[PDB]
Amino acid sequence: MAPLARLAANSARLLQLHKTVPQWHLTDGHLSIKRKFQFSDFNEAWGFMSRVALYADKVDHHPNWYNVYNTVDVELSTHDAAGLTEKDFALAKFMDDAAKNFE
Amino acid sequence: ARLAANSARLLQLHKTVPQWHLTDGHLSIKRKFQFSDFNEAWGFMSRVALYADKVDHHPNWYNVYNTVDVELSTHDAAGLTEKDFALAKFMDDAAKNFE
Amino acid sequence: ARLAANSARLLQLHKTVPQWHLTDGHLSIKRKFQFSDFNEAWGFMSRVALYADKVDHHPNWYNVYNTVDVELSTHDAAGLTEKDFALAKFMDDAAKNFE
Amino acid sequence: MAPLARLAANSARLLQLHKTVPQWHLTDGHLSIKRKFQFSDFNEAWGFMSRVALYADKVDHHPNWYNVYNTVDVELSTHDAAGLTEKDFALAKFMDDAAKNFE
Ligand code: NA
Ligand code: NA
Structure with missing residues (x-):
């Protein structure tokens, strides 16, 4: 009895949004997206996470993320x-853009 | 040095961080921290991040909004080594500020 | 709306953040926060940073090791506006965790 | 009665270090270095500061920095x-490298 509508699996809109975040993987039933980010060290990973934290609390939409030293394993x-909703894809995009600074 | 399962030093160190639990084989220690919101959780994590990079010893941590699930x-x-218990103690002390 | 110097609303709001001082012309409010070390100071600043970007209202702050000198x-x-006093209050509450 | 030796003004070593951080300005008497960093917004500035904070507490050498939204005014x-000592120039270099990710 979820109060919000989710994007349907394989919906045109879901696919349109996924195109913008192509390094993310759709999970079974298209119920989430995943990406594991890799950095040189923890210092870089933390700089990345810090920007994402600010964004997440601004939009009140938070990542499920697992950090181990230089890696950040994320499911949205x-x-x-x-x-999935529009908010997940918007968060993924922000995260992609924040990570690009390190490649 | 690696602390052997049930070793005197391991058991002694565990007493300093009693809210943590030993996992199978005493291969790690775990604690799930809970805060009021993400803002608090992040304030907590921020202090731990500084400590972790200072001592070059890092948590395996999973954050979802106001919770931080940690395995060291x-x-x-x-x-396990002494460093894990030292990190646990720092984390405990950082979390106490939110009680 | 801009709060006029000595206006009833300004004076009322100032009572909620009594450790802050009004500057000349009541153009800003100031407080210098002191912590035990940089690690604490940074934990404090981290919570404030999240709040600041959430409400889109930012401190003018000068950090030197364990001190954070703030003007809003x-x-x-x-x-001054209501937003400055709201930010001051959040900062006060964040700092209280280190008392 | 400073317990540590400072780099002398215009010393060959001071100049050798300054060459590595050319966007920094030497102040009067060569007693400090200054740089004002500019970013797109606070979110970027905070990501930058976050990396520097980790470095600073690791080496126990801290910036005197003033942040106002998207700018970070630094004196070391x-x-x-x-x-000035070697530590100031090492910190400046780290900061330069962290800021480069945003240009
Ligand atoms: Na979620
Ligand atoms: Na200094």
């Missing part, structure tokens, strides 16, 4: 939709 |  |  | 030397 979904 | 072990030791 | 004013108002 | 010196 909207709990209140039981699946 | 020494990567090149294939188990 | 609303850049496009040429004086 | 070693109090215990009453002037």
Whole structure:
């Protein structure tokens, strides 16, 4: 009984958004997106995470992320939709753009 | 040095961080921290990040909004060392500011 | 709206953040925060940074190791607004965790 | 009665170090170095500061820095030397490298 509508698996809109974040992987049923970010060291990873934290609390949409030294393993979904929404893709895009500074 | 499962030093160190739990084989210690919101959780993580890079010993941590699920072990030791317990203690002290 | 010097609303808001001082012309409010070390100071600043970008209202702050010298004013108002006092209050509450 | 030796003004070594951080300005008497960093917004500035904070506490050498939204105005010196030391230039270099990710 999720109160929000999720993007349907394979919907034209979901695919349109996924095109903007091509390094992310759609999970089974298209209920989330995943990306594992890799950096040189923790100092870089933390600089990346710090920007994402500011964005996440601004838009009130937070990553499920696992950091181990120089890697940040991320899964995004909207709990209140039981699946993906526009907000997940917007967060993924911000994260992609923040990570680009390190490549 | 790697701390052997149930070793005197391991058991002694564990008493200093009693809210942590030993995992199978005593290969790591775990604690899940809970805060009021992400803002608090991030303030906590920020202090830990500074400490971690200072001592060059890093947590395996999973953050979801107001929770931080932490597992500590020494990567090149294939188990626990003094550094894990020192990190746990710092984390405990950092979290106490939010109680 | 810009709060006029000595205005009823300004004086009322100032009572909520009594450790801050009004500057000349009541153009800004100031407080210098002191912590035990940089690690604490940074934990404090980190929470404030999240809040600042959330509400889109930012401190003028000077950090030297364990001290954070802060002046708040609303850049496009040429004086103080409600947002400055709201930011001051958040900062006060964040600092209290280190007392 | 500073317990540490400072780099003398115009010393060959001071100049050798300054060459590595050319966007920094030597102040009067060569007692400090200054640089004002500019970013697109606070989110970027914070990502920059976050990396520098980690470095600073690792080496126990901290910037005197003033942040206003997207700008970070920095002055570096070693109090215990009453002037510049190798540590100031090392910090400046780290900061330069962290800022380069945003240009
Ligand atoms: Na979520
Ligand atoms: Na200094």
